[PDB]
Amino acid sequence: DDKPKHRLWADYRRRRVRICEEYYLDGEGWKFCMFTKAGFIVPPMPSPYIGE
Amino acid sequence: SQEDYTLEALTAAVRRFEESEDATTEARAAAERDRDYYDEKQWTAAEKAA
């Protein structure tokens, strides 16, 4: 969860969001996703980082 | 127009300052207590009176 717990203000427009960046080893190779609890930000694609 | 944007910016800045001030109240109090302890002020008013 977010840190720290500060009371929300009606006149305050600052909003905090949480993203999840996950790298998972699929049957063909490593895949990288950027998502939330509502929908995808970056759709599942092969990892853009080249290994050894 | 410009007046509304200026008012919104001022409100945002004031809200940022208030968030910073309130979110660190306990930490500021603890730091002030540590500074007082370093500054020979180690007795509370109630204990000193007692």
Residues of B in contact with A4 (CB under 8 A): 23
Give Cβ neighbours of residue A25 (< 8 Å, ≥ 6 apart).
A31
Q: Are A41 and A21 in contact (CB under 8 A)?
A: no
d(CA B44, CA B30): 14
Cβ atoms of residues A20 and A6 within 8 Å: no
How was this structure determined? It was done by cryo-EM
Burial of A34 (0-12, 13-18, 19+ CB in 10 A): middle
* B window 1-40, beta carbon within 8 A of A: 8, 11-12, 15-16, 18-19, 22-23
- A21 phi/psi in degrees, rounded to 5: -110, 110
Nearest to B23 among A6, A11, A12 (CB): A6
Q: Hey, are the CB atoms on A7 and B12 less than 8 Å from each other?
A: no
